[PDB]
Amino acid sequence: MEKIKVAIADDNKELVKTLESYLADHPQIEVITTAPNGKVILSLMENDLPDVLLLDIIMPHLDGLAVLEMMQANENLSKVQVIMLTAFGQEDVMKQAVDLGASYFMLKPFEFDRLVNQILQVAGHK
Ligand SMILES: [Mg+2]
């Protein structure tokens, strides 16, 4: 049973806690790191790349679109499927996510299993 490697970057620690637990329990998903802001995920993104990055747009110090733009310029996005997560679903923002190479965009709140199903779409095979 092959595991899709997932990383999470979000500044709501209770969501990161819950979501890491839920995704790990899935047979085809392995959560390999979590970060609470944009700087920390970039530190981690050096050296260690997931198949899927769950990425909150609104974050202290360094936000989701900044991370996405840095990762697109470092050729990370060829491997990494980035799924933007946010309650700020403004139409120009999405457009930026698209230009900066996001695979997907999801609104908070979301059903966990519906997010699982999108992880399997962007990174699952057979
Ligand atoms: Mg946020």
Question: Which experimental approach was used here?
Answer: X-ray
Distance 61 CA to ligand 1 centre (A): 12
- Distance of CA 57 from the midpoint of ligand 1 (Å): 6
DSSP notation for the chain: -PPEEEEEE-S-HHHHHHHHHHHHHSTTEEEEEEESSHHHHHHHHTT---SEEEEESS-SSS-HHHHHHHHHHTT-TTTPEEEEEES---HHHHHHHHHTT-SEEEESS--HHHHHHHHHHHH---
How many A from CA of 36 to the centre of ligand 1?
Answer: 10
Q: Which long-range contacts (CB under 8 A, 24 or more apart) does 103-108 make?
A: 103/52
Neighbouring C-beta atoms of residue 121, cutoff 10 Å: 12
Determine the distance separating the centroid of ligand 1 and the alpha carbon of 121, expressed in angstroms: 24
- Resolution (Å units): 2.6
35 Cα: distance to centroid of ligand 1 (angstroms): 12
Q: Which of 25, 23, 27 is CA-nearest to residue 52?
A: 23
Q: Which domains does the chain have, with CATH numbers?
A: 1-126 (3.40.50.2300)
